[PDB]
Amino acid sequence: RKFMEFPYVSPTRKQLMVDLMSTVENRLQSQLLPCNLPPDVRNFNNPNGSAEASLHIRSGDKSSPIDFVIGSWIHCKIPTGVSLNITSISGFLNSSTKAPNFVVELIQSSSKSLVLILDLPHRKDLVLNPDYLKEYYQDTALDSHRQSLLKLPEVNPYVSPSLFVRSAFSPTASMLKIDAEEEDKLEEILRDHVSPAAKEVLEVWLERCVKEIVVGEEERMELERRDKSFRRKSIEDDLDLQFPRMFGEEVSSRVVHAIKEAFGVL
Amino acid sequence: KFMEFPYVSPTRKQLMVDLMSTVENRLQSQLLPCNLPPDVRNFNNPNGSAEASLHIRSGDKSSPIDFVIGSWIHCKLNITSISGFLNSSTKAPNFVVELIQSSSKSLVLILDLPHRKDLVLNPDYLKEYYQDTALDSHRQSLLKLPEVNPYVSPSLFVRSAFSPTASMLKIDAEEEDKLEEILRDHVSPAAKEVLEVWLERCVGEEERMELERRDKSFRRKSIEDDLDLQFPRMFGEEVSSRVVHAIKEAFGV
Numbered sequence: 001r002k003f004m005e006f007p008y009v010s011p012t013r014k015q016l017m018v019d020l021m022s023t024v025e026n027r028l029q030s031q032l033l034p035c036n037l038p039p040d041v042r043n044f045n046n047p048n049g050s051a052e053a054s055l056h057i058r059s060g061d062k063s064s065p066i067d068f069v070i071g072s073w074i075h076c077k078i079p080t081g082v083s084l085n086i087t088s089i090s091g092f093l094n095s096s097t098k099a100p101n102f103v104v105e106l107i108q109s110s111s112k113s114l115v116l117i118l119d120l121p122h123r124k125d126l127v128l129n130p131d132y133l134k135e136y137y138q139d140t141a142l143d144s145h146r147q148s149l150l151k152l153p154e155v156n157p158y159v160s161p162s163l164f165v166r167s168a169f170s171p172t173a174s175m176l177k178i179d180a181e182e183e184d185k186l187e188e189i190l191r192d193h194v195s196p197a198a199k200e201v202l203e204v205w206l207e208r209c210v211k212e213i214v215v216g217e218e219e220r221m222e223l224e225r226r227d228k229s230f231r232r233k234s235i236e237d238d239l240d241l242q243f244p245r246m247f248g249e250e251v252s253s254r255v256v257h258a259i260k261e262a263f264g265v266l
Numbered sequence: 267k268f269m270e271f272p273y274v275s276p277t278r279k280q281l282m283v284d285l286m287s288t289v290e291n292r293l294q295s296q297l298l299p300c301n302l303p304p305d306v307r308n309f310n311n312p313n314g315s316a317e318a319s320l321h322i323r324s325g326d327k328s329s330p331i332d333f334v335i336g337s338w339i340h341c342k343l344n345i346t347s348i349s350g351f352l353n354s355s356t357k358a359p360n361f362v363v364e365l366i367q368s369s370s371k372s373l374v375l376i377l378d379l380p381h382r383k384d385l386v387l388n389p390d391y392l393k394e395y396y397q398d399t400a401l402d403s404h405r406q407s408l409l410k411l412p413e414v415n416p417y418v419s420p421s422l423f424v425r426s427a428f429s430p431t432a433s434m435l436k437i438d439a440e441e442e443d444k445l446e447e448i449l450r451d452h453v454s455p456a457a458k459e460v461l462e463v464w465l466e467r468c469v470g471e472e473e474r475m476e477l478e479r480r481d482k483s484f485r486r487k488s489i490e491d492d493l494d495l496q497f498p499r500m501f502g503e504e505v506s507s508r509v510v511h512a513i514k515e516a517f518g519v
């Protein structure tokens with residue numbers, strides 16, 4: 001299984017991703033459809049041999065609160081020596097449910113410096129819905145992970161170039177930049193702090209978001225328009241310019257269309 | 267007495283007077299006179315422990331302004347703050363500036379135009395008011411300074427309520443001389459550039475009932491957070507009763 005090999009990243013980074021995906025796949029095994037991506041979407045590369053990638057999408061079934069779950073690793077050798085590695089898993093719920101989504105993402109281009117994003121993005125306006133802030137974020141101590149990771153001297157806040165991106169993450173989101181010195185210290189951070197944190201945030205999404213009133217009429221619609229506004233804008237700003245470049249045009253066309261199709265975006 | 271800011275440094279007084287006078291000079295015709303009983307403009311705890319001044323100027327029924335609130339607070343702590351609140355007639359962002367301080371060389375600053383509709387639902391709102399206005403350049407710039415560091419609110423609610431360009435910052439200088447240097451030269455310009463974007467920010471009804479209960483939900487929450495707990499244990503159960511009345515009446519709860 002080429003996806004699950006995570007071939008360009010460190011053993012701990014790999015292990016974190018394998019464990020996260022198995023847990024999701026095993027735990028949602030009754031609700032997930034078999035993955036459906038054509039062989040040339042599950043894996044692809046830039047024809048010139050300098051970018052390669054892998055995608056794993058499982059849609060939820062008809063009575064399931066899951067829309068889909070997606071994992072990916074991207075490797076892209078930058079011409080200016082440095083080499084970018086992205087690994088991410090994201091869980092998306094549908095409007096039969098108001099609960100938060102899941103995101104974890106590790107982005108790296110230095111050997112001892114790495115961006116972590118780990119969150120449970122909200123699907124309701126948190127200022128209109130203090131009750132929602134309370135059940136999903138306060139009563140949850142989701143914040144203790146952010147603060148704890150922050151206590152490390154190698155860890156600083158990461159703030160997205162995109163205003164849209166800052167605004168779509170929850171108030172407890174861990175958006176962190178790690179770096180120091182030896183890469184052995186990085187590995188120790190990954191292994192001793194980032195994995196436990198990621199695994200636990202996944203447990204809360206699985207136990208508290210997925211497993212669950214019953215969502216009425218006008219609330220169901222609000223969720224659809226908000227969710228589809230998010231995906232639509234999130235794709236255009238990150239996919240359409242990055243993939244064309246990284247991968248070249250014909251392959252970007254194929255994958256973006258499949259990603260768009262998985263996401264529900266026209 | 268409000269405009270004296272008696273417990274903050276000269277440069278703190280200078281800022282807050284400049285800002286409030288700007289507000290009051292630009293809006294001049296859209297604000298009704300102050301109408302607080304004088305025991306609410308000014309009050310203290312029985313013993314000298316705590317004083318506070320408030321200044322509330324309602325806009326009239328036909329301007330875009332719901333109200334403007336000014337205040338300074340001191341206990342044993344120094345807080346000075348100027349909020350601007352718009353009514354339904356307009357979808358535009360509010361204004362908040364706030365300086366919290368409990369040292370003499372370290373100081374929290376919040377400075378923002380809080381959004382009045384959901385930023386993920388409305389990316390068009392986002393762009394109009396936040397990207398196109400360069401508002402983030404302020405926090406970027408302040409943060410370049412070796413003394414300034416992200417502040418993060420302990421309250422998950424207040425984190426929620428701030429826009430993504432919000433300058434929420436902790437300033438920690440070696441000597442308080444060097445704090446006033448930053449205060450006079452970085453904070454002050456940024457606060458006025460930001461206020462300027464709020465004022466020189468120059469259509470209909472069910473868009474408006476949304477603005478309404480959203481505005482009310484923030485207002486209600488943002489006031490328990492503060493004045494139901496913190497005020498009675500600072501000024502005494504009784505004083506806090508009438509000023510929470512005034513505040514709650516002005517805020518519309």
Ligand code: NA
Nearest residue numbers: 150152153155
């Ligand atoms: Na740190």
Ligand code: NA
Nearest residue numbers: 409411412414
């Ligand atoms: Na700084």
